[PDB]
Amino acid sequence: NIKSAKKRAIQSEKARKHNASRRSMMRTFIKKVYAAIEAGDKAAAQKAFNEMQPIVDRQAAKGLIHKNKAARHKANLTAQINKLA
Amino acid sequence: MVTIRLARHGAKKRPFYQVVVADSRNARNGRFIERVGFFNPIASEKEEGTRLDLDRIAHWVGQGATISDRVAALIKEVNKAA
Amino acid sequence: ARYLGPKLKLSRREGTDLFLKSGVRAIDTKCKIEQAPGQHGARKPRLSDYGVQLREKQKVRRIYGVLERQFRNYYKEAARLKGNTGENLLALLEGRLDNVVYRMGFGATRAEARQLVSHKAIMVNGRVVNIASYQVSPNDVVSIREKAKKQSRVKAALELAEQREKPTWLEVDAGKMEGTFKRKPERSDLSADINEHLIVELYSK
Amino acid sequence: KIRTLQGRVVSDKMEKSIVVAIERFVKHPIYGKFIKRTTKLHVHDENNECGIGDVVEIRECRPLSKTKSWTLVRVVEKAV
RNA sequence: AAUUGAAGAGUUUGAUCAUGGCUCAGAUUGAACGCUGGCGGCAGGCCUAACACAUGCAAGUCGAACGGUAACAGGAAGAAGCUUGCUUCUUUGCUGACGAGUGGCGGACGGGUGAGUAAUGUCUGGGAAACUGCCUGAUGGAGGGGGAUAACUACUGGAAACGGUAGCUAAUACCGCAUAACGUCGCAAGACCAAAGAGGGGGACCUUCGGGCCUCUUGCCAUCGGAUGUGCCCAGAUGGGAUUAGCUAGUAGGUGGGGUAACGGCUCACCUAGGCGACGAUCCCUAGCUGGUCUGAGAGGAUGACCAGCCACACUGGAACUGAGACACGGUCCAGACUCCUACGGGAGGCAGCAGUGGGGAAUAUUGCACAAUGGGCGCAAGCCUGAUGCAGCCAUGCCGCGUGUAUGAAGAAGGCCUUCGGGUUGUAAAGUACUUUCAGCGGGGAGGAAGGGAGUAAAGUUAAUACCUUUGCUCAUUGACGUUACCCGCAGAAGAAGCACCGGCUAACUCCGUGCCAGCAGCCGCGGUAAUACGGAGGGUGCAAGCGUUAAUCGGAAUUACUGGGCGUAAAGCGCACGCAGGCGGUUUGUUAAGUCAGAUGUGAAAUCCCCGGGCUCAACCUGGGAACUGCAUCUGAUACUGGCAA
Ligand SMILES: [Mg+2]
Ligand SMILES: [Mg+2]
Ligand SMILES: [Mg+2]
Ligand SMILES: [Mg+2]
Ligand SMILES: [Mg+2]
Ligand SMILES: [Mg+2]
Ligand SMILES: [Mg+2]
Ligand SMILES: [Mg+2]
Ligand SMILES: [Mg+2]
Ligand SMILES: [Mg+2]
Ligand SMILES: [Mg+2]
Ligand SMILES: [Mg+2]
Ligand SMILES: [Mg+2]
Ligand SMILES: [Mg+2]
Ligand SMILES: [Mg+2]
Ligand SMILES: [Mg+2]
Ligand SMILES: [Mg+2]
Ligand SMILES: [Mg+2]
Ligand SMILES: [Mg+2]
Ligand SMILES: [Mg+2]
Ligand SMILES: [Mg+2]
Ligand SMILES: [Mg+2]
Ligand SMILES: [Mg+2]
Ligand SMILES: [Mg+2]
Ligand SMILES: [Mg+2]
Ligand SMILES: [Mg+2]
Ligand SMILES: [Mg+2]
Ligand SMILES: [Mg+2]
């Protein structure tokens, strides 16, 4: 507002919208797996886990979700799928 | 990050620095990891103008600490009484 | 700082000569010693304990030409030093540079020696020392500066100092105007009238 | 050997949990008399079947629920 | 070497001894006020309104990340009036550089304040279920593509703030794909995740002759480490009030799901009725905590100003984004109070950052110089920024040091005061005489804080390269705000430099005159109603001294909250008596435990400060080397006399 920090403000805004888009995509991919588990279709749950796994793994690499959270999601969903099957 | 620097602790117009191992983000006279040695710009004719133990300096340098300009100059000047 | 006033008044009040003059006279002739100062000078002869303690303290202070604050600092240092407090205090008082100059005899009085020291006529260990309260240590050579040497003041003070007490704790050349502080004066080396053990209690009150 | 504590259970019914009272005999800072204090703490234990007047061995462990960071190790004798 | 430590007095009575209060002698302060005031060194300087703020400054930096010519410091071409070959004027990014823009790092550091917080913080001692920009060790990769956008152009709304529409463009910006182990998910088979280039130099072989190619430096990506920082958990300690006794429903516990970097009612669904509290819960008042400081012989009491560590906050309330790290002092959004600008359509603001202003108050300073040194941010470096910091200005606010001259000097001068009117005192005091010039003032000389950085050479290192680059030596110009520096030297001249309180006892120091219970004094006892050592003045004297005194506050004296270390027949003080829960204490004999207790060892108890021995500022204050202390806490190993537990 008084120093050239308006550049930081603009960068923060654009990064905010970008990261929000990525987060929404990842959350959609994660939630469809839970929908499959609730439906009880083992094949659908496994198929939804497969293509979702690279998304979370790569978003962890990009510096948006972190390895521990990325692994937590995979571990929980794998446990649920194994129990269902 | 750990670094070796000076800390002015003398008096007005009579500086007396102390070489300390401290995190860079801390203040000049703030918290330091440990104290290595001292330095007196007013050397005079006394038998003690500058002293520091090289063992811990080498320990920290090989552990990943940096050296300020004045501290590096002092190290290479003292070497061993030469 | 200094007193800057009549000198015989101090001796009259204290009842004894404090060595505030050259020595040729001003001991009996123009003193009226033992008569106390002022209008009620003679018509008084009574004193309390606290009175005698204060009188002894002021006697020492007026002998050595010091003020209350500096004397209290000296007392604190003497108490801090391990040993006998009175002996430490007397040694500290005797170790003053101006007092040492007077003992060596380069000055007729403490005031004259202090004036020399302030006017930069005394050197210690081959260096100038302008401070009168400078503390002299054992094995120290005290001498007059090479330049401005052979002055009427010191010339007229040596022969007077030739024989008064002959101090034994320091050496005097009496030639090139040099001396030496080889040891620290022992109590014995210093009078006997002073009851230091009254000042010690005065500063305990 | 690991650091532990010893105290009496005197705990009420609870699912896999018990409160223990560690007794210590400390000296009064000012008056110098020796007096006894108490420090009740909650302990986790599965297969919990401890009584009221039981002496138990307690050990500090990972935070297990709030107000619970201790677990039992051994029980010496019983109440009755 | 570091334990050399302890004083009382006045006042109740005709007098005495007790008890018991009040007062004084000491030390200390971020002090204020009155009188006075020469110099220097070191330190300190809004304690009240977390009241409101005009103005200036306090966070920028990278062209060696990328598009670019808006400044303009060069050069070249071309057109030209020509100085007649030298100038000028439009293009032109080749160029030393660079406003604006994208991108990276930094803005979470430094600095300010003590509102809130009574334990969710702090101190001590431990722990496990975590992350960590920059800095470092090791082991491995660094292949090939894509689509946009700012800047920039053409229009348009605006008083401003600030925009909107339509086109073009680069990257270490962004996004797939190739690649996948020691990494993630799984018991396993298995599945899956990344990358950026840039700069210096130059042989051979090839170039759309804008470079490929070789080498060197630096940069990027993944895993395991190190170090540093941060997050979390446990025990003990850390104010007052019982004229506050009951308080708690996500409350206490469990199963499952969710969530965080990480454990966890952190959050949901369900199940149980639990949890805290007299060893003080809940409620109310006050308060940042500590190392430390003051005082005290000690134990204790008071306190947290400066310095250092931690915490909390940034006009008030709330929220989250970005980021490694904020729920962010000079960021964002919403709401509120207040203020300001306006062309009335609409906008802006946060000094508890450094100066400074208004206000409040007994009270607290310059709208200063420099990045020379130290330390931070960016950068390969040069270098830029830095109200951090180094200095300077104001204040006797404190501690320390020096000076305001020295020697002689009887006619004991004159005047003042007293005087039994003999004289005494002021008083060697003054005058006079003989000497010196510290410090002020004038004139000269001149350390240290300066190490580095730069330019040029020699050696070594690396390599296809005598290149370029790095390291190590050598040579040449240098870099100071302080600064009319510290310090030294020379001239002249006692010349420019002393005041404050008190004098009845406590308590050191007495006479006269004025007044007459009036005026007045007074810390306590108390003085003054015509002979006042107590009021006012004078003389004299005592104490301290560039200070002196008064007021405010803490400790001491006060053994006057008595743990060390007090009392209750009559001075205050035994409940009217009794029974009894909790609590406190408990005869004797042995065994056992080892909790209390005692012994040794280890770890720790930041630095500074206090103390002992030393060193440097001309001595001191001040600065500084080593030690001691840091009386504590935790763990381990032993002792078993006593207390406790168990058994007989
Ligand atoms: Mg600026
Ligand atoms: Mg630019
Ligand atoms: Mg800070
Ligand atoms: Mg990238
Ligand atoms: Mg992949
Ligand atoms: Mg759970
Ligand atoms: Mg918890
Ligand atoms: Mg006491
Ligand atoms: Mg306190
Ligand atoms: Mg984030
Ligand atoms: Mg900020
Ligand atoms: Mg501000
Ligand atoms: Mg300010
Ligand atoms: Mg006012
Ligand atoms: Mg003084
Ligand atoms: Mg120089
Ligand atoms: Mg008297
Ligand atoms: Mg009268
Ligand atoms: Mg007491
Ligand atoms: Mg009593
Ligand atoms: Mg009775
Ligand atoms: Mg009974
Ligand atoms: Mg017994
Ligand atoms: Mg034991
Ligand atoms: Mg010395
Ligand atoms: Mg020291
Ligand atoms: Mg310490
Ligand atoms: Mg027994």
Short mmCIF file of C-alpha atoms (C1' of nucleotides) in Angstrom, two decimals, chain E residues 340-485:
data_model
loop_
_atom_site.label_atom_id
_atom_site.label_comp_id
_atom_site.label_asym_id
_atom_site.label_seq_id
_atom_site.Cartn_x
_atom_site.Cartn_y
_atom_site.Cartn_z
"C1'" C E 340 -9.40 14.38 5.80
"C1'" C E 341 -10.09 15.43 0.02
"C1'" U E 342 -13.91 16.08 -3.50
"C1'" A E 343 -15.55 19.06 -9.78
"C1'" C E 344 -20.82 16.04 -4.74
"C1'" G E 345 -20.43 11.44 -9.19
"C1'" G E 346 -16.73 9.45 -5.67
"C1'" G E 347 -12.12 8.35 -2.55
"C1'" A E 348 -8.02 8.15 1.42
"C1'" G E 349 -5.94 7.28 6.44
"C1'" G E 350 -3.44 4.50 10.96
"C1'" C E 351 4.09 7.19 14.59
"C1'" A E 352 2.98 1.41 21.06
"C1'" G E 353 9.53 2.59 14.05
"C1'" C E 354 13.48 7.48 14.24
"C1'" A E 355 12.92 12.98 14.79
"C1'" G E 356 8.81 16.22 15.95
"C1'" U E 357 3.57 18.46 17.40
"C1'" G E 358 -1.04 19.03 20.43
"C1'" G E 359 -2.81 17.22 25.01
"C1'" G E 360 -2.09 15.07 30.17
"C1'" G E 361 1.52 15.60 34.06
"C1'" A E 362 5.73 17.54 39.38
"C1'" A E 363 8.39 15.35 35.39
"C1'" U E 364 11.60 13.14 30.76
"C1'" A E 365 15.84 15.66 25.07
"C1'" U E 366 17.44 17.17 18.00
"C1'" U E 367 11.84 17.78 12.80
"C1'" G E 368 20.99 16.32 13.43
"C1'" C E 369 25.64 13.64 10.43
"C1'" A E 370 27.31 8.81 8.19
"C1'" C E 371 26.81 4.04 6.20
"C1'" A E 372 33.89 5.18 7.92
"C1'" A E 373 33.46 0.43 11.58
"C1'" U E 374 30.05 -4.07 13.28
"C1'" G E 375 25.64 -6.57 11.71
"C1'" G E 376 21.55 -7.58 8.31
"C1'" G E 377 18.51 -7.78 2.85
"C1'" C E 378 19.72 -8.46 -2.67
"C1'" G E 379 23.60 -9.46 -5.87
"C1'" C E 380 29.20 -13.68 -8.97
"C1'" A E 381 31.21 -9.22 -7.78
"C1'" A E 382 31.43 -3.94 -7.97
"C1'" G E 383 27.68 -1.98 -5.63
"C1'" C E 384 22.55 -0.26 -3.57
"C1'" C E 385 19.43 -0.08 0.91
"C1'" U E 386 19.77 0.06 6.40
"C1'" G E 387 16.33 6.44 11.95
"C1'" A E 388 19.70 -1.30 13.09
"C1'" U E 389 24.13 0.58 14.30
"C1'" G E 390 28.39 4.21 14.85
"C1'" C E 391 28.51 9.33 16.22
"C1'" A E 392 27.00 14.26 17.30
"C1'" G E 393 23.28 18.06 19.79
"C1'" C E 394 20.11 19.20 24.91
"C1'" C E 395 19.66 18.09 30.52
"C1'" A E 396 24.44 18.53 37.26
"C1'" U E 397 19.66 12.99 36.11
"C1'" G E 398 23.46 9.63 38.31
"C1'" C E 399 28.90 7.67 39.35
"C1'" C E 400 33.98 9.17 38.87
"C1'" G E 401 38.12 12.74 38.19
"C1'" C E 402 40.20 17.81 38.19
"C1'" G E 403 40.12 23.15 39.04
"C1'" U E 404 38.39 27.56 41.31
"C1'" G E 405 46.25 28.91 42.93
"C1'" U E 406 51.06 28.02 46.12
"C1'" A E 407 54.94 30.04 49.87
"C1'" U E 408 55.87 34.06 53.04
"C1'" G E 409 53.49 37.68 55.59
"C1'" A E 410 52.11 41.32 62.70
"C1'" A E 411 51.14 46.92 62.12
"C1'" G E 412 47.79 40.63 65.10
"C1'" A E 413 46.28 46.90 59.86
"C1'" A E 414 41.06 49.07 58.83
"C1'" G E 415 35.77 47.81 59.23
"C1'" G E 416 32.02 44.37 61.52
"C1'" C E 417 30.61 41.67 66.16
"C1'" C E 418 31.16 41.17 71.46
"C1'" U E 419 33.10 43.59 75.50
"C1'" U E 420 33.05 43.12 82.84
"C1'" C E 421 35.46 48.57 77.99
"C1'" G E 422 41.67 45.72 80.10
"C1'" G E 423 40.46 43.49 75.62
"C1'" G E 424 38.84 39.13 72.49
"C1'" U E 425 37.22 37.32 67.60
"C1'" U E 426 36.90 37.71 62.49
"C1'" G E 427 42.58 36.64 61.69
"C1'" U E 428 47.94 34.78 58.14
"C1'" A E 429 42.56 35.89 57.19
"C1'" A E 430 43.12 40.62 54.06
"C1'" A E 431 46.86 44.24 52.12
"C1'" G E 432 52.06 43.63 50.76
"C1'" U E 433 56.06 40.44 48.92
"C1'" A E 434 58.22 35.77 46.05
"C1'" C E 435 56.63 31.96 42.71
"C1'" U E 436 53.64 28.29 39.05
"C1'" U E 437 49.91 27.95 34.89
"C1'" U E 438 46.55 22.11 35.71
"C1'" C E 439 41.68 23.48 33.63
"C1'" A E 440 39.21 27.52 30.55
"C1'" G E 441 41.04 31.13 26.11
"C1'" C E 442 44.57 31.98 21.56
"C1'" G E 443 48.20 29.72 18.10
"C1'" G E 444 50.82 25.09 16.00
"C1'" G E 445 51.91 19.57 15.50
"C1'" G E 446 49.52 14.94 15.28
"C1'" A E 447 47.98 8.42 16.97
"C1'" G E 448 44.05 4.88 16.72
"C1'" G E 449 39.45 3.14 15.30
"C1'" A E 450 41.32 0.66 8.35
"C1'" A E 451 40.27 -4.61 8.10
"C1'" G E 452 39.16 -4.76 3.48
"C1'" G E 453 37.78 -3.51 -1.71
"C1'" G E 454 40.24 -2.06 -6.45
"C1'" A E 455 44.26 -2.13 -10.59
"C1'" G E 456 48.70 -4.70 -12.22
"C1'" U E 457 52.22 -8.91 -11.97
"C1'" A E 458 54.57 -14.18 -10.16
"C1'" A E 459 53.50 -19.35 -8.42
"C1'" A E 460 50.22 -23.25 -7.88
"C1'" G E 461 45.41 -25.61 -9.02
"C1'" U E 462 41.67 -27.42 -13.14
"C1'" U E 463 41.54 -28.68 -18.54
"C1'" A E 464 41.58 -30.34 -25.61
"C1'" A E 465 43.09 -25.31 -23.87
"C1'" U E 466 50.30 -20.52 -22.65
"C1'" A E 467 43.05 -20.04 -22.26
"C1'" C E 468 39.09 -17.92 -18.80
"C1'" C E 469 38.45 -19.03 -13.61
"C1'" U E 470 39.97 -20.02 -8.29
"C1'" U E 471 43.68 -19.95 -4.29
"C1'" U E 472 48.30 -18.19 -2.56
"C1'" G E 473 52.46 -14.28 -2.66
"C1'" C E 474 54.25 -9.48 -4.53
"C1'" U E 475 53.84 -4.11 -6.61
"C1'" C E 476 50.70 0.62 -7.32
"C1'" A E 477 46.74 4.49 -6.13
"C1'" U E 478 43.78 4.59 -2.36
"C1'" U E 479 38.75 4.15 1.47
"C1'" G E 480 36.94 8.47 8.40
"C1'" A E 481 30.50 10.80 10.16
"C1'" C E 482 33.02 11.50 14.57
"C1'" G E 483 37.04 15.60 13.44
"C1'" U E 484 38.18 22.86 15.09
"C1'" U E 485 39.57 14.00 17.26
#
